[PDB]
């Protein structure tokens, strides 16, 4: 099949506006010495650590 007619501006924009992305949320690193933003349930790219203020196990050597 082929598009019979050129789609109107209103309809094209109605469909196109739904092509979007949500913002990444980010969470503050539990390490007091780092305090950076990292993905939830993900090792902090700055400190390379994971876990609550206590645990704090190293995950990434960075």
């Amino acid at each position: 099949a082929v598009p019979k007619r050129k789609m109107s501006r209103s309809n094209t924009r109605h469909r196109r506006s739904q092509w979007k992305t949500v913002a990444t949320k980010l969470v503050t690193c539990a390490n007091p010495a780092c305090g950076e933003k990292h993905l939830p349930h993900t090792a902090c790219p700055s400190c390379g650590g994971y876990g609550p203020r206590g645990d704090r196990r190293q995950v990434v050597e960075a």
């Binding site: 092509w19 979007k20 992305t21 949500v22 913002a23 990444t24 980010l26 933003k37 993905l39």
Partner: protein
């Protein structure tokens, strides 16, 4: 008739208000794909925006992040503002030069390919201007 108060980007975007801006011209990516991230980053605090764009999965995040950082530096240098009290007042993506290329297809046909490009503009002002 040409004369004084000649138009300028600063005059058009800020108009005697404090703040600065930055333009990335001829970004070798599509304007729509840049807008997909511009819409998210518009209106945010500048530091929050750049930290988020370090994690945004789209490829448009990197050029937009660099533009925001450049605008932040321009503001810090030319108006004494601090990076932590700036917010992205404006942000938009216009279309730049497009290159026509050829992709060969079946039965000897050639299909047009458009390599698009974008201009990214970000305007940062002190957060006190948000309620003004």
């Amino acid at each position: 008739m040409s004369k004084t108060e000649r138009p300028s980007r600063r005059a058009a975007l800020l108009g005697d208000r404090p703040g600065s801006y930055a333009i990335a011209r001829h970004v070798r990516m599509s304007a729509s794909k840049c807008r997909r991230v511009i819409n998210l980053v518009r209106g945010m605090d500048a530091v929050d925006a750049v930290t988020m764009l370090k994690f945004q999965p789209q490829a448009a995040a990197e050029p937009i992040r660099k533009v925001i950082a450049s605008a932040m530096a321009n503001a810090e240098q030319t108006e004494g503002l601090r990076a932590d009290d700036l917010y992205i007042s404006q942000a938009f993506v216009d279309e730049g030069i497009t290159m026509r290329r050829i992709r060969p297809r079946a039965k000897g046909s050639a299909s047009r390919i458009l390599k698009r490009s974008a201009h990214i503009t970000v305007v940062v002002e002190p957060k006190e201007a948000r309620q003004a």
